[PDB]
Amino acid sequence: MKRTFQPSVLKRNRSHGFRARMATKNGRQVLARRRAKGRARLTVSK
Amino acid sequence: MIREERLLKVLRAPHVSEKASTAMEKSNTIVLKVAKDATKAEIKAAVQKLFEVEVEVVNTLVVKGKVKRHGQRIGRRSDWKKAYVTLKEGQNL
Amino acid sequence: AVVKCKPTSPGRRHVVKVVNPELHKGKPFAPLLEKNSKSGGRNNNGRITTRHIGGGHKQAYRIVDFKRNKDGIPAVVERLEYDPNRSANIALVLYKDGERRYILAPKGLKAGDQIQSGVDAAIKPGNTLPMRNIPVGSTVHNVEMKPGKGGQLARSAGTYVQIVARDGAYVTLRLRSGEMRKVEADCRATLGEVGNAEHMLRVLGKAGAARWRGVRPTVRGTAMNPVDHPHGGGEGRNFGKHPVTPWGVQTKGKKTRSNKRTDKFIVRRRS
RNA sequence: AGGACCGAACCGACUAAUGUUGAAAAAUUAGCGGAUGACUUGUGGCUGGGGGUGAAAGGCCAAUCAAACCGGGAGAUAGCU
RNA sequence: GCUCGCCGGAAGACCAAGGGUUCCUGUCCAACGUUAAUCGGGGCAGGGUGAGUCGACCCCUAAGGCGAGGCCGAAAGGCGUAGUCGAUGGGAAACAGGUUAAUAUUCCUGUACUUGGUGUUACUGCGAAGGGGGGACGGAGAAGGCUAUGUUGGCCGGGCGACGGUUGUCCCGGUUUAAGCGUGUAGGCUGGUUUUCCAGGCAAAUCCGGAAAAUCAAGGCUGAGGCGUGAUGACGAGGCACUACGGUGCUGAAGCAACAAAUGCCCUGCUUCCAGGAAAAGCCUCUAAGCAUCAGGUAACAUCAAAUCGUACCCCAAACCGACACAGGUGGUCAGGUAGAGAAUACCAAGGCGCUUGAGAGAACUCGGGUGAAGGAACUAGGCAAAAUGGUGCCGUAACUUCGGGAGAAGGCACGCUGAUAUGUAGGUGAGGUCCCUCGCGGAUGGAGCUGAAAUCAGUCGAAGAUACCAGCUGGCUGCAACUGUUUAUUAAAAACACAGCACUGUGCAAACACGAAAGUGGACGUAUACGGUGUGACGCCUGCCCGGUGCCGGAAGGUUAAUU
Ligand SMILES: [Mg+2]
Ligand SMILES: [Mg+2]
Ligand SMILES: [Mg+2]
Ligand SMILES: [Mg+2]
Ligand SMILES: [Mg+2]
Ligand SMILES: [Mg+2]
Ligand SMILES: [Mg+2]
Ligand SMILES: [Mg+2]
Ligand SMILES: [Mg+2]
Ligand SMILES: [Mg+2]
Ligand SMILES: [Mg+2]
Ligand SMILES: [Mg+2]
Ligand SMILES: [Mg+2]
Ligand SMILES: [Mg+2]
Ligand SMILES: [Mg+2]
Ligand SMILES: [Mg+2]
Ligand SMILES: [Mg+2]
Ligand SMILES: [Mg+2]
Ligand SMILES: [Mg+2]
Ligand SMILES: [Mg+2]
Ligand SMILES: [Mg+2]
Ligand SMILES: [Mg+2]
Ligand SMILES: [Mg+2]
Ligand SMILES: [Mg+2]
Ligand SMILES: [Mg+2]
Ligand SMILES: [Mg+2]
Ligand SMILES: [Mg+2]
Ligand SMILES: [Mg+2]
Ligand SMILES: [Mg+2]
Ligand SMILES: [Mg+2]
Ligand SMILES: [Mg+2]
Ligand SMILES: [Mg+2]
Ligand SMILES: [Mg+2]
Ligand SMILES: [Mg+2]
């Protein structure tokens, strides 16, 4: 069976990376929430 | 021309190993640990000036650090650069 | 000509093809080509705004001269060409100064024919004049609606417009739909009708032939569930409803034109 | 020539047996259909939740779909257990 | 270590994605490993990834994204111009041999190539954000010419056989060599050259386009392979000397020919069809502004530079996606022998493995298989399952038919081996010799050698010759749907959906319609032989009556009737 996670680094970064989160207001709010929570890894880039 | 202090900082340590010794004895090549950001021209000039030898060519690679464990705590060693420096068949540093 | 295919397989039995032996076999004229990629019927929001579009064969756009405003210089037809973008054929013409252009091919036009544009052009098929200088009763195609804008009416294969009357600054036309319309007498038109009149006699023969032209299947509204279409639902085949579009508007007879700006030019609806 | 024919790769899933705390949260074995096409496949892209997409089964939209998931209103309300 | 077994269009070998040290060495066996473990992809320590030419980066763009101003929107924001990003595509350049425990087109040896910067010299009209050319493009089919590669012979080295025979028509092994440079072949395309002129290519143009003359007919472009050189080199069976038994050193024969032959190359060709088959840059060329014995351009020579990042290892898998060392999934390349149409199948080669619990026993019963007296569907909801059929050539083949089909209808006969025709035939390939010429990778003749079906006749063995693997069951009547397709991922594949065809209906272009507070966008760079909606569903013969009800279309005299006043 083909499973749902089919990894690809380029797609991962283009979809959830830091510069994708920074491009929109809601993405920046995601980053603000994650900084307030105290997350060690902010996005999938790291 | 590269300034003297840059040259004084690029080279870090000679590298000792079986492959390094074999390279020295069979190919007139020494193996050095250099600064992570040193370029081939910088390394060439530094070996020319500090060891007053004549270099033929420099080959360079980056070594990735290993992931270890120190009592159930994971750590990583730093990446470093090593250079294979080929001398001009008459120097024998 | 119109050619029936031998029934050597169930997909060939009903195929009728329209083959023109005098169309150019080689490649099109490169300087007048241009890319156009497909849309799938999706607009700039990326949503399907026109259903049943998608796929088909890749095509290149031919830049057709609908203005025909290179007046006073005669041209000669070099060849007739196939055009995937339209039902009519196009002709590559060569002006006496060395410029080449594509025009819609009128009926009867062959390679070596002479065409010309302008107020002094002869009354021959393929020539373009303002409808002021065209005799009443003539059949024309590629009709302009605003002077200088380029031909917009009667461009499909086999269609034409008849000039019915002239009254001062306006002429009255009889369009293929049967509607009588007024346009300004300074709009241009080309004499004769568009060639390839056999285009309607073709029979595609199989589903795949429709797919090759970028047409995707049509699902009947009555075959759906009520959530998808106003016609959906039923245990078995049931209708009991007045037929409507997928968005709830009556679809058998209800009129949808509402344009008061242009109502003044419609002498008589098609009926 | 052909949405032609027989048949591997490839794409499917008609029958039977097994399996059913499985080798596997949909498979295996033996047969089975298409196999130049309305085919199939890699990479990248677009369409976002009363919305999409649908050769239409209320199908599919990350093992979730007659209205996804996550957080909030929120200790919703529960003449019921 | 010897034997046995399994895979071999993979269970071998590479690349991409993805992973990230799992790679190699030393050491340890608690935990991990479905058992033990001295072993490990486990723990601990050390080592290991070398590039001007490979990839990324870089130049150029596709879909698409973002988007100065701009247009639009309560705000947030939406769209979009100039631009700027974005490969899955276009763009310069390296091969062979050797070497490490672990890297190698990167190191070493040998032989090459590309781009750019400086400098000298010799000539010289250079110049773009512009023009033109080029790049530059489909499906199918058919050959012809080749190569990879294989087979046989010759040649070279070795052998003379555990048991009858084996100095020969005998056995075993080897017989390899690249990029580059020179030649420009099979073959493909295209007439060439010189003047004069011109409403075209936003301006100009000597370039492209067009027109008119003159002259010559061979000129140009592309091009696999071969041959020569690279190479007196390297490699090379084996032998000799060490071995600290893993390996190290030294030396080194032959290194040819014929035939067969790709799905690879010529070929981005050729032929044909309709469904009519990217873009931009690199590159060539033309000039404008401008510059002007300057700059710049062309050529030769000399010299310098080519940075940075990746490079280990797995990669149909114990390392990726499935919670697992999980019978699942995963794109691309390579492609030997015998038989075979074949990438099917059987047995093998190169290479790789025996799937991380065993040992016994030989009950019922379960699973996967083999055979079965007589009967032969009596079973059962139902011939479910099983059994059976199965190849090639030839003979022969019904109703019905839309004239194609039905049809491989049905059914039948031949089939191994040996000899002869013919010491190997028809055919294919083709050396030497001979003769010509525009002289060469040339043309004609010529047939040595090699390879080689199919058939007929005779004989011969078995129960059986398509002997294994592989490989249609057939016929008759009828419902439904014309057909090929599609569908409920995971209990439904169908008579359901689609379909070509038919009809009604809307729509005159700023189209109807759809997405959207809007700007806009699709429809469509389309224009009624077009586009949307609805129903029906190939084809044949057809499609009757009802406008009372409900819709829709038209009308606008009268009645009733909103805001307003
Ligand atoms: Mg080097
Ligand atoms: Mg490097
Ligand atoms: Mg439609
Ligand atoms: Mg239809
Ligand atoms: Mg239904
Ligand atoms: Mg409804
Ligand atoms: Mg009913
Ligand atoms: Mg009823
Ligand atoms: Mg077929
Ligand atoms: Mg099923
Ligand atoms: Mg199966
Ligand atoms: Mg079939
Ligand atoms: Mg088949
Ligand atoms: Mg239902
Ligand atoms: Mg799901
Ligand atoms: Mg709801
Ligand atoms: Mg509340
Ligand atoms: Mg509660
Ligand atoms: Mg075997
Ligand atoms: Mg580790
Ligand atoms: Mg290991
Ligand atoms: Mg123990
Ligand atoms: Mg254990
Ligand atoms: Mg380990
Ligand atoms: Mg763009
Ligand atoms: Mg935008
Ligand atoms: Mg702005
Ligand atoms: Mg760019
Ligand atoms: Mg790429
Ligand atoms: Mg290795
Ligand atoms: Mg050969
Ligand atoms: Mg490697
Ligand atoms: Mg295991
Ligand atoms: Mg597995």
Ligand SMILES: [Mg+2]
């Ligand atoms: Mg697959």
Ligand SMILES: [Mg+2]
């Ligand atoms: Mg096989």
Ligand SMILES: [Mg+2]
């Ligand atoms: Mg037993």
Ligand SMILES: [Mg+2]
């Ligand atoms: Mg049994």
Ligand SMILES: [Mg+2]
């Ligand atoms: Mg049996």
Ligand SMILES: [Mg+2]
């Ligand atoms: Mg029996």
Ligand SMILES: [Mg+2]
């Ligand atoms: Mg019996």
Ligand SMILES: [Mg+2]
């Ligand atoms: Mg019987």
Ligand SMILES: [Mg+2]
């Ligand atoms: Mg019975």
Ligand SMILES: [Mg+2]
């Ligand atoms: Mg009974």
Ligand SMILES: [Mg+2]
């Ligand atoms: Mg059965």
Ligand SMILES: [Mg+2]
């Ligand atoms: Mg059977």
Ligand SMILES: [Mg+2]
């Ligand atoms: Mg019945």
Ligand SMILES: [Mg+2]
């Ligand atoms: Mg059917």
Ligand SMILES: [Mg+2]
């Ligand atoms: Mg079918």
Ligand SMILES: [Mg+2]
């Ligand atoms: Mg199902």
